[model samples]
Target: ERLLDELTLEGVARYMQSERCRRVICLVGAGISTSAGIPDFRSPSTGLYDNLEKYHLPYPEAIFEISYFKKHPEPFFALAKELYPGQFKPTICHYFMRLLKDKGLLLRCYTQNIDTLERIAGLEQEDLVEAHGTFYTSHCVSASCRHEYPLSWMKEKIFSEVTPKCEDCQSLVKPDIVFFGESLPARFFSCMQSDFLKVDLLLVMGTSLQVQPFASLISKAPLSTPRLLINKEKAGQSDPFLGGGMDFDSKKAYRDVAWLGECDQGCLALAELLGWKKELEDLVRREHASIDAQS
Candidate 1:
């Protein structure tokens, strides 16, 4: 147990500085994306799953998993009304990564979110690897024909609520999102192997870290490297990944390591502590400055 208290943002900032961290490989999930307006399902009351039960599905995952959607697409498309990328804007924290990129400290961002907010916040395509795939690309499922279409075409269909078809063969075109039972995006594994070898600090943000492969990415980093997990609830000490043995106490073991009680507040507090408050504020201000431009 922590002798004092749970580590605060101020403490986290000091930890990062004391470690002399430089390049960071960020592993992000849906909770951070919720700040950008994409609702996460893990949280009980306010999360998407808790509320989406109105869809009257037997289970939540059945509503969007590929096999289920193949049988009944209406529910998935209905949810897509909110989940479609253009409906939301990137949060201030998203711009923080851009600033990191500008400072040349960002190595890469491996995100499980399909929201594409990172790209909206100005992360270059090459600098990011969306492990679940994204709406940015789409293609036919047919392996023999193997046709593709520009994102504009898919966007048009999705927005227009028309069934999208491949340009060459006119077959159905599905967004490249990694559906349940589908293989992980081919690029994701390859890039991870390459980036893991050189990563300095691994920042896991806004995720339950229960999902496979993604949660496993942390283990790939060198043991000497420090890992910061920003999540709502603390992970169990007996979880095995965080160095707990067979006799570990779940409650006592997680007493210290977990940081961030809430994502938005946690990030804002940390930004202020690290003296990046001004930088972050300026980015938010600039985002709002051009409101009339949008108007």
Candidate 2:
């Protein structure tokens, strides 16, 4: 309701239907899970890291930093208590992403969240690109160990407070989730090049779009492709050239970043108008008014 018009969802559907836009991509982040009761992990003032920083850790990032895990894994596990998977279920907003896949329009889902809610929402492995990796995927802190664990093991550890171990050697285990000083998943880059170029529409949901590297992925899309941003606040314009070798002219527009009130309500509204399943359509309407109030 703030800047969203009545026809916004309908307009988006119409455009996607008419433009012959075959591939649709979705980028997701923390805000999508706020409605599901998971706390945001990035807010410096009140986030999980900030709240735990009183332990006199050399740096706030030390808790999740892969390097630090080699020295003191106890802190990482302490922090993991707040980030348990399956503790919070997927929101209606997640179901909307499933709807996108059912329509055969989903090209890729680039997500920064480690919650693995996308899997819970029924997105196939092919439909997703976990940009920041996830708690579900784990590896050894010792690079020389050359060990890796199935992401499912990390899921079990996160929920049950059990420390994971590398099978290759008895080395310290760390979640494959990208840390402050760590690199993103290699597949994320390949997808940005291969699948992202073929994307016809981009739906960015629940992120402020400020996180580095991954945040720049959206600009990698072809300029003519339409990009829709659904978040609580407007993110600043990113330097397109700074995006990993993908160059876009400053004057070029992929599309105006579409403003949606909240991931849950915005997605529901869109699904309802598109004649999606009644269960999903109803879930969205239930959250619609509160979204309006927040806006």
Candidate 3:
């Protein structure tokens, strides 16, 4: 009980509610969206890759490869229909971000997810960064004519089983989602250097921190900053199951860190600790109820 003042989740929660920790930065990945009916990329049997057998691609990763996408756009279009926004409601974990914003505690939310659930969850554009790009907008593949289109345009064509063609270049139109061979958005780089420095608390959720650039962010925060990891399995240690890999340098790791359970449950527990259980539950219930009425 004496350790409750330590920089654990309890400690952080106290700081969070006391206004000592205002600039809370969050790094999120696919795990946060799994409960929303969106499967993450690499969960072996239950992951999206495992279910891609029906796509019959040469390889699972080929779905996101820019080179392969240019040749065979059908598989991607097929996947996009299922993955596109507005189909699923944001989870309680997602609403947690909004709650942070409402309380003026969030510094920024860096997400690797292509789904626009964060936006749907009510996070403002300035406070969120889609690190890997998103399906909110699309563009033509032709270098000569990089025409952009709203997500509505792409959805209309894709959902109708028609491969969208650029009016000017006659090339296939794909979402802004960063393909394997493409570069990440400029915003990701421009903000990463400056934004993380101001963070007093960092919350990492639902990610294995395996992907490069995105994975490197955990270490980029100031060593003094407190970090909390909410994930399915423990990471960065030499675990026989986690494949003995490391994401952050041992020397540069956070001065204070906490590992929580699953994304939704972790946030729910945190909200309860901070005396926000009723508010959190109300938002989730309203969201689900609205979705059900629409359906």
Candidate 4:
């Protein structure tokens, strides 16, 4: 228990109940949303661009290439419907975070995922920050006529196979999600310092990234602030021999508690310890039922 008063999940739960850790900052990434059937589509074998011939794309993720899209946006437009069909359900992990907010313990949720699952799971704008920007907004490619568009507007046009055009300039339109060479949105830097300064506890889950933005962001939090990692694999640890950073590790980790498992089940376990299992499950069951009914 390098920094934790106790090392076990129960100990973590005990810490949570204490007033010392009321404000929690969550650092999450892609791994959290995989259960929702969202595919990364980065691998060659996923059949991601099997139909690339029709789109005349060069690489598997050629659609993500900003240069490629300037001439022919049909490549991206054709996959938009499949990219974000927006029908997937949030996983148990999502609800557990919601439960944190419901318990009024969450100060903010920062995610590298562009899927918007956090928002779908009931996180609000003021409390959530999308590190990579969002699918919630899109803008015209033509700088002079760079009119803005909303998620609803994208759904109707951009979300379909139809290539959405600027009403003002007839230029291609794209979601605000960051492309290669693009930096994090301005929001990432704006409200970051104050949140970390006051953050009493940090929870990192799902993502297996090695020293990513969130992993390094751990340094920004007060040293006394505990960080709990709930992930499928051990990660985010730095190798001093190879020039590394942060103390997230398999053992002797400072200010961190390591728990390994699937993101959902890990959250369920934590919620169980918090006596919030029924609440989490009920939220999942009820929301799913409503989705089924509506469908």
Q: Which is the winner by TM-score between candidate 1 and candidate 2?
A: 2
Q: Name the runs in model 3 displaced over 4 angstroms.
A: 1-4, 50-60, 82-86, 237-254
* Clashes by residue pair, model 1: none
Q: What is the lDDT of residue 199 in candidate 1?
A: 71
How far out, in Å, is residue 198 in model 1?
1.6
lDDT rank, highest first?
3, 4, 2, 1
- Per-residue accuracy of model 1 over 1-295 as CA lDDT, tens digit each: 2321233445446655554567778888887867665776445565455557667776877875877766666666566654565454677667777777876778999988877778877899888989878877778766666587767787777767776666677666777888887899778889888988887666677876677777778767765455666678654224546451111124533213456566666667767777787888888678646532575
Q: Against the true structure, whose TM-score is highest?
A: 4
**RMSD to the hidden true structure, all candidates:** 4.8, 6.7, 3.9, 2.7
Instruction: Estimate, for each residue in 169-197, the C-alpha lDDT of model 4 and write its tens digit.
Output: 88888888877556777788876878987
Clashing pairs in model 4, backbone N/Cα/C closer than 3 A: none
Give the whole-model CA lDDT for all candidates, comma-separated.
Answer: 0.68, 0.71, 0.80, 0.78
Query: After TM-score superposition, what is the CA distance of residue 164 in candidate 2 from its true location, in Å?
Result: 3.2
Please, what are the lDDT tens digits per residue for candidate 2 over residues 190-241? 8788987688877888987787787777667776666676777765355457
Q: What's the lDDT for residue 48 in model 1?
A: 54
Could you tell me every candidate's TM-score relative to the true structure? 0.79, 0.80, 0.86, 0.88
TM-score of 4: 0.88
Tell me which of candidates 2 and 4 scores higher on lDDT. Answer: 4
Q: Which regions in candidate 2 have their CA more than 4 angstroms from the true location?
A: 1-7, 142-147, 150-163, 236-254, 277-295
